[PDB]
Write a protein that binds this ligand. Structure first.
Ligand SMILES: *[C@@H]1O[C@H](CO[C@H]2O[C@@H](C)[C@@H](O)[C@@H](O)[C@@H]2O)[C@@H](O[C@@H]2O[C@H](CO)[C@@H](O[C@@H]3O[C@H](CO[C@H]4O[C@H](CO)[C@@H](O)[C@H](O)[C@@H]4O[C@@H]4O[C@H](CO)[C@@H](O[C@@H]5O[C@H](CO)[C@H](O)[C@H](O)[C@H]5O)[C@H](O)[C@H]4NC(C)=O)[C@@H](O)[C@H](O[C@H]4O[C@H](CO)[C@@H](O)[C@H](O[C@@H]5O[C@H](CO)[C@@H](O)[C@H](O)[C@H]5NC(C)=O)[C@@H]4O)[C@@H]3O)[C@H](O)[C@H]2NC(C)=O)[C@H](O)[C@H]1NC(C)=O
Ligand SMILES: *[C@@H]1O[C@H](CO[C@@H]2O[C@@H](C)[C@@H](O)[C@@H](O)[C@@H]2O)[C@@H](O[C@@H]2O[C@H](CO)[C@@H](O[C@@H]3O[C@H](CO[C@H]4O[C@H](CO)[C@@H](O)[C@H](O)[C@@H]4O[C@@H]4O[C@H](CO)[C@@H](O)[C@H](O)[C@H]4NC(C)=O)[C@@H](O)[C@H](O[C@H]4O[C@H](CO)[C@@H](O)[C@H](O)[C@@H]4O)[C@@H]3O)[C@H](O)[C@H]2NC(C)=O)[C@H](O)[C@H]1NC(C)=O
Lengths: 207, 207
């Protein structure tokens, strides 16, 4: 009994035309008795025929895996067009269908706020710098840290929590050594979201 | 006939006035096959303190049976395991399931209260920030109180594994800009086993 899994493009892939958003349809538990699989793709009902399906790979449980990837348009995804993957197999009484698209709802511009560290944390070895992004819809977002054009990598981004007013919020905490923050250095919190102008914004944070 | 187990709520075990109540769930019950059985084993030894709630009726014609067992607070904190066993006339084997608290040395959380950014002053409301970090396990509970009464207009982020192996999160309490300008004091309460008396709190006020 095969099962089908569908995945959305990464949030950054759609916010800039420099990248290529894609939707991947994965089939697992492909029986050895009947390993033939056909992929039918549909976008808002009408069938599309520009899908690039890779040949099957046998897994270690003697079950094959077929993967079909369809490259989508940036504006089509941001306009909320449903993508449907149809998988047919001789071992399936009925074909399996999976649909995916952007979450419905009017886009909402996120608010970016940078918080200087608490006074209590000025005694410890390292100092936490926090960035608050709130009110953005949908949850597809990307937050990054850098200083003087150089990325910072000791940070963790929280999952988008559903706020009380139907919107989303999250926190991105950057961990830095004490000495760096004491020198009056400037750090920037970079946020990319579809409701922001040019799908990008940043705010500085210094002593 | 799927078996699912869930741990007690993190706040239940930290207060002796509550009940942990480990929950065992059996979904996709067989329509014609009745009498879902239940048995419990604690560290191997069988116990009989279960509360088998009467079943419900779901929309897809698959009812649910839940068995409830209350455990000792220290037993869960000491890491004792719990095993729920099920049987039926549609189940060939007695499918089991075991759950225990996360293994590892508990670490004391650090509580930091952060003020709203200067850019957020121009809005009708301001968002308070409480930073909890460096705690393990992820089982924790965060609340907000102001002048002896509970503020409930807040959302708490899920725990996130940090780079050192500890967890962290945030909680955002939203209050009207009028209240914050007066000088009202707001407290962030954190409950964890690694804290003395399983409780600590930090205040936050305009000054
Ligand atoms: C017919 O209809 C059936 C019922 O209808 C329901 O269907 C639902 C989809 C939904 O629409 C409902 O509205 C509707 O009523 C339906 O039955 C489904 O079957 C599903 C089959 O997968 C099953 O889904 C699983 O759910 C669990 C967790 O479910 C809880 O949380 C989610 C949200 O996170 C909610 O669904 C819900 O809130 C569930 O309840 C939580 O648990 C308990 C409740 O008992 C609460 O805790 C207690 O609370 C009380 C409070 O009084 C006490 O305080 C007590 O002390 C507490 O303990 C808790 O608060 C509840 N809420 C929350 C938020 O937690 C998911 O985790 C499952 O995903 C996991 O499982 C798969 C398969 O095993 C794995 O891929 C993986 O599991 C684990 O993953 C780990 C990853 O790190 C890994 O390490 C582990 O090893 C791995 N596990 C194993 C064993 O290996 C996934 O992560 C899964 O989605 C539904 O729960 C069930 N319905 C109900 C009501 O239970 C039928 O499917 C449907 N169709 C048919 C054909 O019958
Ligand atoms: C036979 O073996 C198959 C292959 O498994 C491999 O081989 C075996 C021998 C072992 O070595 C495995 O470790 C190895 O992986 C099995 O296929 C697996 O089936 C299960 C279902 O039973 C699939 O689980 C599903 O996973 C979804 C997400 O999967 C992505 O993320 C995984 C990490 O979390 C990653 O490991 C996967 O490879 C996959 O990667 C994504 O790929 C896409 C495109 O390629 C990328 O765009 C993504 O970025 C990738 N992801 C990441 C994180 O980078 C889950 O979403 C899904 O859960 C959902 O559905 C369930 C209901 O089904 C809900 O309960 C749940 O809440 C959620 O909604 C599900 O867990 C697994 O992915 C399959 N493995 C692979 C590699 O695809 C067969 O199952 C096995 N059969 C038998 C009979 O033994």
């Amino acid at each position: 009994g095969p099962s089908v899994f569908l995945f959305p493009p990464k949030p950054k892939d759609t916010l800039m035309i420099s990248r290529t958003p894609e939707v991947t349809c994965v089939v697992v538990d492909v029986s050895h008795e009947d390993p033939e699989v056909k992929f039918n793709w549909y976008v808002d009902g009408v069938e599309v025929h520009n899908a690039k399906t890779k040949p099957r790979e046998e897994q270690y449980n003697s079950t094959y895996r077929v993967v079909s990837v369809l490259t989508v348009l940036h504006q089509d995804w941001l306009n909320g067009k449903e993508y449907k993957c149809k998988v047919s197999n001789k071992a399936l009484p009925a074909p399996i269908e999976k649909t995916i698209s952007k979450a419905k709802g009017q886009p909402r511009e996120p608010q970016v706020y940078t918080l200087p560290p608490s006074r209590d944390e000025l005694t410890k070895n390292q100092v936490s710098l926090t960035c608050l992004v709130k009110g953005f819809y949908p949850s597809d977002i990307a937050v990054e840290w850098e200083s003087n054009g150089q990325p910072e990598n000791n940070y963790k981004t929280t999952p988008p929590v559903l706020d009380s007013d139907g919107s989303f919020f999250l926190y991105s905490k950057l961990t830095v050594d004490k000495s760096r923050w004491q020198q009056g250095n400037v750090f920037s919190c970079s946020v990319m979201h579809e409701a922001l102008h040019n799908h990008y914004t940043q705010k500085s944070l210094s002593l």
